[PDB]
Amino acid sequence: DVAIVKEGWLHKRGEYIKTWRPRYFLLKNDGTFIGYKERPQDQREAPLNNFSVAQCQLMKTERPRPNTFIIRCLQWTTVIERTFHVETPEEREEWTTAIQTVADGLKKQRVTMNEFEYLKLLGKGTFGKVILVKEKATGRYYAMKILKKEVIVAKDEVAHTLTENRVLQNSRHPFLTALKYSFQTHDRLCFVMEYANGGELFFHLSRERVFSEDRARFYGAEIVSALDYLHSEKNVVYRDLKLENLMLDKDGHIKITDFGLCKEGIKDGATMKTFCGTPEYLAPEVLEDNDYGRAVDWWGLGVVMYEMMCGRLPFYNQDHEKLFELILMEEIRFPRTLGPEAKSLLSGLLKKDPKQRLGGGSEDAKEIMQHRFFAGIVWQHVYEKKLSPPFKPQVTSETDTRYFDEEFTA
Numbered sequence: 001d002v003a004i005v006k007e008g009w010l011h012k013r014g015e016y017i018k019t020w021r022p023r024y025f026l027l028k029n030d031g032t033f034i035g036y037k038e039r040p041q042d043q044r045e046a047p048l049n050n051f052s053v054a055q056c057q058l059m060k061t062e063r064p065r066p067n068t069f070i071i072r073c074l075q076w077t078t079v080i081e082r083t084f085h086v087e088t089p090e091e092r093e094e095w096t097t098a099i100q101t102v103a104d105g106l107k108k109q110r111v112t113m114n115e116f117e118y119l120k121l122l123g124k125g126t127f128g129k130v131i132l133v134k135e136k137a138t139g140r141y142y143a144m145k146i147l148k149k150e151v152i153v154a155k156d157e158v159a160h161t162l163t164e165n166r167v168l169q170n171s172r173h174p175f176l177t178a179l180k181y182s183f184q185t186h187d188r189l190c191f192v193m194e195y196a197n198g199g200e201l202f203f204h205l206s207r208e209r210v211f212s213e214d215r216a217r218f219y220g221a222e223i224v225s226a227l228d229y230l231h232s233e234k235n236v237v238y239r240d241l242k243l244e245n246l247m248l249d250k251d252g253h254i255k256i257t258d259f260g261l262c263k264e265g266i267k268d269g270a271t272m273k274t275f276c277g278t279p280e281y282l283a284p285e286v287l288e289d290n291d292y293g294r295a296v297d298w299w300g301l302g303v304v305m306y307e308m309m310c311g312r313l314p315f316y317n318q319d320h321e322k323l324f325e326l327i328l329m330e331e332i333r334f335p336r337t338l339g340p341e342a343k344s345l346l347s348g349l350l351k352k353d354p355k356q357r358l359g360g361g362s363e364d365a366k367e368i369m370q371h372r373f374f375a376g377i378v379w380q381h382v383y384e385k386k387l388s389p390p391f392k393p394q395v396t397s398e399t400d401t402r403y404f405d406e407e408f409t410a
């Protein structure tokens, strides 16, 4: 019964390269709102929540451009926005009503700040901030997302239900940073995420310069297990897989972080173009604001695992316009000290075309789990943490502060 409600050409502002791009968007009755470079010829795959307009607020703005409408959604613990533009105000009204109608159709179905000690600002965003905190009672480390309540819910009662549910709805996968607490103030919504104390993966990789293929296989296997979970259970694309979002716990297992917030990019002055963060890890289809899916995360896996085994980023250049081209056009090269199994995996994961990318098919993660690089790996044992970590972080417990002291200056 899944059908198209409305379709046509729109102008979508880039999510990382913030410029207006002509896209053909499809609005469906299941809530999906997806744009393409060209209107597609053709479904069988399960829908992705990244494109859902369910439980979202629509806003009509004349800034930065007239006839602009925005779809703002809270997805898990991050407030995201998709900005669109049409030619006439009448055309905007038709889209907004349609989207709202679909969203309405899907509608039908004590922790306080005093308990935490402020430690350090982790990041700032448009709709809030993320800080490193320590629960006074236990001494545990947490990342607290502090978001503006206005941009999320209009009622305190609905926000309270959101706080209760997010904790219960919390996915229990060993390699994802769990949402531990959720509470609200008078004007702020707070998400308390667990913070690994085993050190950043960029820190560990920087010190030992390069990981062995065995050690990279371990980390890679745990990442695959996590991504498989998000895709098949939560039906969501992570889209943030990079070295900076990987940490180790006290035992040496991978933790994929959820500490990010949506920001306004930094204007460079180079043709006055705004860029959001750094693009070295971005998948080609994402960089071009094209249609994207689960294959994005496998590109991310390729990027991460490339750097672990090679000791450098797959694509790098000081100029962004050149860096874009390397990501979009240049073939990936490998060191001659890299084994054939590793090269096969990396080349497959770093395919330019997501439809041809390893794990890009309908079988998703299973295509990667069956790859010869992960031969011998018992994937049930990976999820159950039966695999012993090749590196044991120098910490006595979960409250050990070594990777929070002047030891990481090295």
Ligand SMILES: *CCC(=O)Nc1ccc2c(c1)n(C1CCN(Cc3ccc(-c4nc5cc[nH]c(=O)c5cc4-c4ccccc4)cc3)CC1)c(=O)n2C
Pocket: 015, 016, 050, 075, 076, 077, 078, 080, 081, 082, 169, 170, 171, 176, 177, 178, 230, 234, 236, 237, 238, 239, 240, 256, 257, 258, 260, 261, 262, 263, 265, 275, 276, 277
């Ligand atoms: C340039 C800065 C910026 O913000 N750019 C930008 C622009 C537009 C965006 C952006 C970003 N995003 C982000 C894409 C990355 N995701 C990361 C993320 C994905 C998924 C989860 C997550 N979701 C869950 C949903 C439901 N149940 C769950 O259990 C979930 C668990 C997780 C999770 C994943 C890893 C670790 C812990 C939990 C979290 C983060 C954030 C938004 C974007 O969407 N748009 C449009």
